[PDB]
Subunit: 135 residues, 3 copies
C-alpha cells in the first residue's frame, strides 16, 4: 500500500530508536527473503550508499553483507550501529526501506519497492509516475 510505505519510510530516520530496528522484519517476513526482496535491497543500498561506502555487486553478496558482516569499501565504518549482531543486522536492513521517501531514489525504484517489499500489484502501482486523464 502507498500509505503504509510512506508512513514506514517517513517515521524512521538517521537514528533507529529502541523499537524501529525491526521495521524490516515487520514489513518483510521473518524467514529467508527470497530473491526479489534482496535485489531491491541491493539496488537501494547501491543508490543510497555506494557514493561513500562502496556498492555491492551480487544478490548473494547482499545476503552475506546483510546478515553477518560487511562487504563495503575497506576501511569504511558501518552504515548504522544500534547494538548487538541480531539487532545490528536488522537495523542495517531497515535503514534501506526509508529510501521510498528520499529524493535520491528514483520513481522506478519506488514502484519496485511497492511491488516487492510491500504487497502491491504492478499494474496498480504503475500510476506512481505522472499522467493526467482529464479527471
Amino acid at each position: 500500500k502507498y500509505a503504509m510505505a510512506v508512513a514506514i519510510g517517513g517515521s524512521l530516520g538517521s537514528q533507529l530508536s529502541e523499537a524501529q530496528v525491526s521495521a524490516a522484519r515487520v514489513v518483510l517476513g521473518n524467514g529467508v527473503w527470497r530473491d526479489a526482496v534482496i535485489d531491491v535491497l541491493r539496488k537501494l543500498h547501491n543508490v543510497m550508499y555506494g557514493g561513500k561506502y562502496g556498492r555491492i555487486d551480487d544478490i548473494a553478496a547482499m545476503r552475506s553483507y546483510l546478515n553477518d558482516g560487511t562487504g563495503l569499501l575497506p576501511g569504511s565504518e558501518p552504515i548504522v550501529d544500534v547494538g548487538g549482531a541480531e539487532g545490528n543486522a536488522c537495523a542495517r536492513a531497515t535503514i534501506l526501506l526509508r529510501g521510498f521517501s528520499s529524493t535520491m531514489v528514483g520513481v522506478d525504484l519506488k514502484i519496485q519497492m511497492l511491488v516487492e517489499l510491500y504487497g502491491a500489484e504492478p499494474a496498480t502501482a504503475a500510476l506512481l509516475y505522472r499522467g493526467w486523464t482529464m479527471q
Copy 2:
C-alpha cells in the same frame, strides 16, 4: 481509512518531490473522477486558496481548472509548479488532499474527505468530532 489519510496528507507538503505529485491518482482513481471527488476538491481549494488566488464556483469549472489550466484570479501565479502539463495538473490536484492535516479545513470537510476521497463509511466516519461515551 484514518491512518491512510493522515499519512498521505502529512507526508507531502509545500514541495511535491519527484514522486509525490501523483498521490492524487494513487488515492483516487486514474480515470475521470465523478462528481463527489470534484466537489470535495473544489471545497478544499476554496477553503485553502481562495483568500489569495480566488475561489471557483462550479463543479464543472473545477474540472476545467484542474486538468488543463486555471480559473483563479487574473494575474495570480499558479498554486504549485512541478514540471510539464501532465505532472503539473496532477500536482495541482495533489496539493489539495494535504488539507486533511490542516487547521484551516474544518472537521466536517475532513469527514467529507474521508467519505468521498478515501473509502470510508459516513456512519463510521462520523466519530471525527468530539463525544465521550464513558469508555
Copy 3:
C-alpha cells in the same frame, strides 16, 4: 497494523488540533472499552506521566480518571486541555496513544499497544524486538 500505529502516533503531538482529539474514539470503539484497552492506557499513562502528575493504580480508577475528571497528584494541572468536557476527555485519552512512537515506552508495551489498541495478533506482533534469520 504497524503503519497505522506509526502514522496515528506520529501525526499528533503536544497540541491536539481541532480534529485530532478524537483519534482515540477513531482507533478504539465509541462504546465502553472493555478492560484490556483500559489496562494498556493505564500502563501508558503511568510510564509517560507518573513522573510528574502521579500514577494511577487500578483499571477502574483509570476509567474514573479518563471520562469525568482526574486522579492525578493533588495540585497538578491537567495533562492536556482542549475545550469542553466531551472533547477534553477524548483528548486526555488520545494523548496516550502517541506513546507508540516514544522512546520512554518500552518495546513490550508497544507490542501490547499493537495487540490491544489496534487489531494485531500476538504471534505476528512478536517480531517487534530484534532477531535475525539470515534473510
